[PDB]
Paper text:
BT3349-S1_274S-sulf and BT1596-S1_92S-sulf are active on all O4 and O2 sulfated CS disaccharides, respectively. BT3349-S1_274S-sulf contains an SpII signal peptide and, due to its endo mode of action, it was hypothesised that the enzyme may be attached to the extracellular surface. However, when the cells were sonicated and the disaccharide incubated with the CFE, Δ4,5UA-GalNAc4S was completely degraded within 1 h. This confirms BT3349-S1_274S-sulf is a periplasmic enzyme. An inactive form of BT3349-S1_274S-sulf was crystallised with a CS-A tetrasaccharide, but only a trisaccharide of Δ4,5UA-GalNAc4S-GlcA could be modelled. Electron density for the −1, 0 and S subsites was well ordered whilst the +1 GlcA was partially disordered and makes no interactions with the protein. The endo activity of BT3349-S1_274S-sulf is conferred by an ‘opening up’ of either side of the 0 subsite, allowing glycan extension in both the +1 and −1 direction. Structural comparison of HGM, marine and human carbohydrate sulfatases reveals that the linker between β-strand 4 and α-helix 5 is extended, and/or alterations of the C-terminal subdomain commonly occur in the exo sulfatases, precluding endo activity. In BT3333-S1_156S-sulf, however, occlusion of potential positive subsites is achieved by an insertion between β-strand 3 and α-helix 4. These features would also prevent extension of the sugar chain beyond the 0 subsite in the endo sulfatases. The structural data of BT3349-S1_274S-sulf shows how endo-sulfatase activity has evolved and could be used to predict/guide engineering of sulfatase function. BT3349-S1_274S-sulf may enable BT4410PL33 to contribute to the degradation of CS-A and DS, where O4 sulfation would be inhibitory.
Here we report how a core PUL has evolved to metabolise the complexity and heterogeneity of CS-A, CS-C, DS and HA. Crystal structures of the two PUL-encoded carbohydrate sulfatases provide key insights into substrate recognition by these critical, and therapeutically relevant, enzymes. PULCS/DS/HA encodes two O sulfatases belonging to the sulfatase subfamilies S1_27 and S1_15, the endo 4S sulfatase BT3349-S1_274S-sulf and the exo-acting 6S sulfatase BT3333-S1_156S-sulf, as classified by the sulfatlas database. The data presented here reveal how the HGM has evolved a core GAG utilisation machinery (PULCS/DS/HA) to target diverse GAGs in the human gut.
Author numbering: 23 to 508
Write the structure that this text describes.
């Protein structure tokens, strides 16, 4: 048969926010000082798994990522070019896409989704106050996902988005809303343990399972004890700011900097929650039977580059996501600088569960399962992964976004981060970031393009290839045709 799979992906979690990057072996495999975070469960897990230094969120923003995650397609084809909200009818997960849940399901898996989905355009949808939005907030951010639209998940315990961490809410398989008054991650984790124990007979123990856990923290808020457990907070409470924010690209004097205490608390708590899932696998013997992956949708600046916006930028702090894959006696624990792109996750996870031959044709990403199973595999490693920023385009008579402005395309290679920003009226180069991530890992030194013709010309060629391959708007609109060979 085919093994079980759990994909645990807390929102807004930097690859750099993991203890083990300062630990022996690991710390020699990355250019950065890891954040001073206490993540013991993940640290141990990392010594059992293939660990990437260089997984990329091509569009480091919730819905765009989730769209690539679930469909294995870039944001021009996922259905999901923008963050989902009542402003953006143009952005919602394609009904007609053959998603990760659909393939698993079609192959005999029970599939179960816990926590944040943030992939559907809000509608007056609400199962229990019908013809009504699920919240009053305008714009509307949250959404209910009916059985018709759950792409293979026969077990639902999930919201769209809602950032009260100790007052989260969930719709069950039947559309019943639940409001425990419990810190999201530890509730989500207890709820997963129950599904694993098959309490309430919610699952067929003869079928293998596919689980996704979309934890909200360590995403905003992170201002107070409303937003994390005092237990975790106690570790960072009194620590001076210059010993929490160690990245030399940080402005310690930003109103935001204080938030690091609570970010790290949410990180330590998320680790404790992941811990409960792992122990439940061991205590039930499912540990030997199950592919486990720890990931995020995008990172967090946390005052790095004075950005104030956690993400939606090409900085290593925004693009680089954790990616840890444990599959006992199929994957040797090791570190790998594979440049995995989000749309590669779905086909690679199917590869790993031996459903490589069931990858839908519409999928744009590639199946690196062979490379996970075999260090020494004749498989081509990517040269780069695309940077993508998509903004609101034009609006209609009723003030709704009905198109997207592709504000930035760029590339991350082994050595370089390049990001080109264009103007909405005159599709002309307006700002340009270029970093030598090897010599300038905190991206302090923005390199002029004119002073680097050999390097830039190569980056322009790799962007061209990739943008043409995914049939990206920059390609179809022959944007910067004058520097980018298509
Ligand atoms: C972090 C941020 O800048 N904006 C995100 C937003 O965060 C608000 C929270 O709801 C609140 O808890 C916190 O303390 O302050 C934020 C605020 O009031 O501005 O939450 C959104 C989801 O609930 C969303 O995050 S997302 O799910 O992770 O990706 C939002 O992200 C911003 O969204 C957009 C966009 O819709 O275009 C653009 C920004 O680049 C992105 O940072
Ligand atoms: Ca997010």
């Amino acid at each position: 048969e085919h093994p079980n799979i759990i994909y645990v992906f807390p929102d807004q979690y930097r690859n750099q926010a993991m203890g083990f990057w300062n630990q022996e072996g690991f710390r020699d495999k990355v250019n950065f000082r890891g954040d001073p975070v206490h993540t013991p469960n993940i640290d141990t897990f990392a010594r059992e798994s293939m660990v990437l230094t260089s997984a990329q969120s091509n569009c480091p923003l919730s819905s765009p990522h989730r769209g690539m995650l679930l469909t294995g397609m870039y944001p021009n084809r996922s259905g999901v070019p923008l963050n989902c909200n009542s402003t953006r009818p143009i952005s919602s997960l394609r009904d007609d896409a053959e998603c990760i849940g659909d393939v698993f399901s079609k192959a005999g898996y029970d599939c179960a989704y816990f926590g944040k989905l943030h992939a559907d355009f809000p509608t007056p949808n609400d199962p229990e106050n019908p013809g009504q939005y699920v919240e009053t907030q305008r714009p509307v951010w949250d959404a209910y996902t009916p059985k018709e639209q759950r792409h293979g998940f026969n077990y639902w315990y999930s919201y769209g988005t809602f950032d009260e961490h100790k007052n989260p809410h969930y719709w069950d398989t039947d559309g019943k809303r639940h409001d425990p008054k419990e810190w999201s991650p530890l509730h989500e984790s207890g709820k997963v343990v129950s599904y694993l124990k098959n309490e309430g007979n919610v699952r067929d123990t003869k079928k293998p399972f596919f689980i996704m856990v979309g934890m909200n923290p360590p995403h905003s808020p992170y201002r107070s004890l409303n937003d994390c457990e005092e237990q975790d907070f106690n570790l960072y409470k009194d620590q001076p700011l210059d010993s929490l924010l160690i990245r030399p690209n940080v402005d310690l004097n930003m109103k935001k900097a204080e938030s690091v205490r609570y970010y790290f608390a949410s990180v330590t708590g998320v680790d404790r929650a992941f811990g409960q899932i792992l122990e439940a696998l061991k205590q039930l013997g499912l540990d030997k039977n199950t592919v486990v992956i720890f990931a995020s949708d995008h990172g967090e600046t946390m005052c790095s580059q004075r950005t104030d916006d956690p993400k939606n930028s090409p900085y290593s702090e925004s693009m680089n996501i954790p990616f840890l894959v444990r599959f006992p006696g199929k994957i040797q624990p090791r570190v790998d600088d594979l440049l995995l792109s989000a749309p590669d996750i779905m086909p690679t996870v199917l590869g790993l569960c031996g459903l490589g031959d069931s990858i839908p044709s519409e999928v744009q990403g590639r199946n690196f399962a062979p490379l996970f199973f075999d260090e020494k595999a004749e498989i081509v490693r990517p040269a780069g992964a695309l940077y993508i920023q998509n903004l609101d385009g034009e609006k209609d008579k009723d003030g709704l976004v009905q198109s997207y402005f592709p504000s930035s395309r760029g590339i991350k290679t082994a050595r370089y981060t390049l990001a080109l920003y264009i103007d909405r009226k005159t599709k002309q180069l307006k700002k340009s970031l270029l970093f030598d991530d090897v010599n300038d890992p905190y991206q302090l030194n923005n390199l002029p393009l004119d002073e680097n013709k050999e390097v830039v010309e190569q980056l322009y060629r790799e962007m061209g290839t990739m943008l043409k391959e995914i049939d990206d708007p920059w390609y179809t609109e022959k944007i910067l045709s004058d520097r980018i060979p298509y």
